[PDB]
From Swiss-Prot:
Keyword flag Cytoplasm: yes
Name of protein: Ribosomal RNA large subunit methyltransferase G
Transmembrane segments: none
Gene that this polypeptide is encoded by: rlmG
Keyword Kinase: no
Source species of the chain: Escherichia coli (strain K12)
InterPro entries documented for this protein: DNA_methylase_N6_adenine_CS, rRNA_m2G-MeTrfase_RlmG, RsmC/RlmG, SAM-dependent_MTases_sf, Small_mtfrase_dom
NCBIfam families: PRK15001.1
Record function comment: Specifically methylates the guanine in position 1835 (m2G1835) of 23S rRNA.
Amino acid sequence: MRSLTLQRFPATDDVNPLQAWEAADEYLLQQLDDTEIRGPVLILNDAFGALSCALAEHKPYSIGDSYISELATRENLRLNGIDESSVKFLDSTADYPQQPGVVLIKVPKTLALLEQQLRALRKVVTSDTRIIAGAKARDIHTSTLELFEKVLGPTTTTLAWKKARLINCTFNEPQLADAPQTVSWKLEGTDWTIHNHANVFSRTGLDIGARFFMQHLPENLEGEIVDLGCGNGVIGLTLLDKNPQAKVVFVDESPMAVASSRLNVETNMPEALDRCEFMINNALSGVEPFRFNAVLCNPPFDNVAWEMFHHARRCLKINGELYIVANRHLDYFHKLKKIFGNCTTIATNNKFVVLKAVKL
Ligand SMILES: C[S@@+](CC[C@H](N)C(=O)[O-])C[C@H]1O[C@@H](n2cnc3c(N)ncnc32)[C@H](O)[C@@H]1O
């Protein structure tokens, strides 16, 4: 956009509708064209760093719940000959810089994340703060606006431009009851309470894919085993409780997922903390090959799952095992067989299948 060269993480080609930026980003930017910018500049959910690159000279803070976004942003900064140091990266749960002058928000996929972010902004914005949100027009719902009025203040909206649309907010500090950071629920059949940060997968209750997976999890495992894409950590917890001698690596792209996992171990079995590693990563990038005895994965429901499978194969030991839950209809059996040479169906739901591939 605007003479910047920008690439998605995993880079895509020219006919892939998925690109590094969308109209919404440019529309947002254009709101500031006739503006003298006063930092701090906060940028939320900047997916591949388009806004961060555009506004680097102002030394923006890029806030979000995605390490992939940070990686992508650093790459794009480099492709544009901009210093990495120009952009400061913050997790969504962190304390935001006080008295920001400009807050740009890409509306996130989930209402819950948006609300936690607006409550976090509520602590730092003033009525002088220029607050603007942008997204595909179709992603701007009445509920979105309502959220804004509830937490920050009165909203104005713009016309559509290339399927994108924006919201302007003027901070009112409206009357608001405080709300918890996490949503908790009891894991059936357990003494465990599972806490879930705003952006965590299936945060309101146990995922049925995971419920099916937990029944056919491998036991009597040693060495290190991976909860690859851990989310709230439930699989990891179950592995710790099932494999007394193993250490468990909780891995997720989302710092909120990792935080949730850490919290759930600290909360439901602190005596096991000595055997846990909590890693924020893009799958297993930069991880030593031949390190693990087992990897367990409930891939997002794709290029992604295949990336995970490959990482799994690479970092597994010989005879190490990858276990997966997947929707029954995807051809994951054959992708696994291709990647590993083998594959075995452990179990199958009405909707889910648990697969197993050995590293050869
Ligand atoms: C379907 S959820 C599985 C959650 C939990 N392990 C379970 O079984 O219920 C998939 C998780 O993978 C994470 N994820 C997506 N892409 C990733 C990536 N490239 N690297 C690491 N984790 C990723 C997502 O944040 C999400 O938490």
